[PDB]
Amino acid sequence: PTACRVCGGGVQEFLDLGRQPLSDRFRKPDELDDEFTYRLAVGRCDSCEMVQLTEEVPRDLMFHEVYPYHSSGSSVMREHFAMLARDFLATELTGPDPFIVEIGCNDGIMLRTIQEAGVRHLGFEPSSGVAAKAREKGIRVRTDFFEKATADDVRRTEGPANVIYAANTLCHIPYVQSVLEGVDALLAPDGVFVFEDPYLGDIVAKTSFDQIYDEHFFLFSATSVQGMAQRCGFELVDVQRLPVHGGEVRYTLARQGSRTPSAAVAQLLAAEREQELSDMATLRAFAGNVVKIRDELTALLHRLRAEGRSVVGYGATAKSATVTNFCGIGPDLVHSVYDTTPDKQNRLTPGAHIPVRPASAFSDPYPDYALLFAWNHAEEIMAKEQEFHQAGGRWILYVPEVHIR
Numbered sequence: 001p002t003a004c005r006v007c008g009g010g011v012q013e014f015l016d017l018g019r020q021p022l023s024d025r026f027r028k029p030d031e032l033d034d035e036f037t038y039r040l041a042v043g044r045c046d047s048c049e050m051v052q053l054t055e056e057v058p059r060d061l062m063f064h065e066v067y068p069y070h071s072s073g074s075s076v077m078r079e080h081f082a083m084l085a086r087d088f089l090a091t092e093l094t095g096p097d098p099f100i101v102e103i104g105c106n107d108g109i110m111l112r113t114i115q116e117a118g119v120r121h122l123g124f125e126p127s128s129g130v131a132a133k134a135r136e137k138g139i140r141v142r143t144d145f146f147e148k149a150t151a152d153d154v155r156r157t158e159g160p161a162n163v164i165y166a167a168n169t170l171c172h173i174p175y176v177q178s179v180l181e182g183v184d185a186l187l188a189p190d191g192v193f194v195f196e197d198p199y200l201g202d203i204v205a206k207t208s209f210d211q212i213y214d215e216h217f218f219l220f221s222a223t224s225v226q227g228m229a230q231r232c233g234f235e236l237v238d239v240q241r242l243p244v245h246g247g248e249v250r251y252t253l254a255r256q257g258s259r260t261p262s263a264a265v266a267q268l269l270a271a272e273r274e275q276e277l278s279d280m281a282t283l284r285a286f287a288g289n290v291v292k293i294r295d296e297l298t299a300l301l302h303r304l305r306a307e308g309r310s311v312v313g314y315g316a317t318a319k320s321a322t323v324t325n326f327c328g329i330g331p332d333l334v335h336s337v338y339d340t341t342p343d344k345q346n347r348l349t350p351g352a353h354i355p356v357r358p359a360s361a362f363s364d365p366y367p368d369y370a371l372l373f374a375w376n377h378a379e380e381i382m383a384k385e386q387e388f389h390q391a392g393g394r395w396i397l398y399v400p401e402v403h404i405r
């Protein structure tokens, strides 16, 4: 019976995805078939409604020198972050000597636009290989985790930040109270801490269980974020839904009572209450839907094999580790996975050990089917792979249901 990392309440489990490997560890084929594994299960705190995993993976096992995800590998995301940076430069970063700190800046996808605007900034990026990619672009980066002590150190030497921003990173951090204390130490009194992460309501609506894996400790909602803010001295003052990464919300927190919440905050809270989003029964219904997607996906993949059809995967997502390991999908059913990330290529996916090959290798003669693990990138990918579909190749999707098109 684990304690909520937000409030210390009791977390009741509703979904057990079993034994899983580290999602972003890609092994060379000659490596020992030994892997770290942990139990992936999700529950909901009884007191603040925060949905969260019940076993933490230690941060240094996930985030370190060879972390492989490079944010800038998607054109949609590069545009998405450039626009956000422009929005901040026009609103929160006006005035003299503004300062923005990004938590989890990766390869500098967002902070490049800030640096090109001449605005003082600091990225925190504890994964040193992508940190170096950002530094190559002229971005100032500390290769450290953001937490209370490193935030204090930055406030000491650099002064208060007008904006603290985190995308697809807050939800990865079980030590969220320490981060919030770091934000309290570092943020200007009239500043904002803005984060965007996969949204519980989209996960439940689309049965997108592959959004649950080691790096995604929290599945935030407006309800839980509002409670988390309030308990830590802040206030949820804006929310915006975003289509990226399968559906997100961007949450804006301010010091309590410094700004009046937008109507959007109340409207999203009322819709979550109306739709019973975080009620344990709704969350168990989702868990039941997850098993149905497993069973239909494996039935399909086995029928394809019996029918002599070839099947590959597209995108060696961290997400797909949950899919292949919960569903038991290995190279006998999905022969290769195609991906543009050099440090994932010529390696095997975690747990299931499917070989990953460069996306340039996905070409005539094409396979019959491609299981689309990077389904959040469907539009971008399929635009680049029209020749596959024109040839008669078909995509297998498992969100929001198993279907082929």
Ligand SMILES: Cc1cn([C@H]2C[C@H](O)[C@@H](COP(=O)(O)OP(=O)(O)O[C@@H]3C[C@H](N)C(=O)[C@@H](C)O3)O2)c(=O)[nH]c1=O
Binding pocket: 069, 073, 074, 075, 168, 172, 215, 216, 314, 315, 316, 317, 318, 319, 320, 338, 339, 340, 341, 344, 359, 374, 376, 377, 380, 381, 384
């Ligand atoms: C856009 C695109 C991606 N890809 C590959 C790149 C990358 O390995 C994968 C896409 O991964 P993506 O869905 O962005 O992210 P992911 O599920 O691996 O998760 C990672 C780790 C992290 N914890 C997280 O939350 C998100 C931001 O990024 O697909 C590709 O081969 N062709 C393409 O056109």
Ligand SMILES: Nc1ncnc2c1ncn2[C@@H]1O[C@H](CSCC[C@H](N)C(=O)O)[C@@H](O)[C@H]1O
Binding pocket: 059, 063, 064, 067, 069, 071, 103, 104, 105, 106, 109, 124, 125, 126, 127, 130, 144, 145, 146, 147, 166, 167, 168, 169, 172, 173
């Ligand atoms: N405490 C912490 N502080 C800052 N970055 C962190 C962190 N824990 C993990 N990370 C970084 O968080 C990132 C998550 S991936 C998200 C990268 C990027 N913001 C994007 O949206 O695409 C990784 O690069 C990881 O190294």
Ligand SMILES: [Zn+2]
Binding pocket: 004, 005, 006, 007, 008, 009, 045, 046, 047, 048, 049, 050
């Ligand atoms: Zn709680």
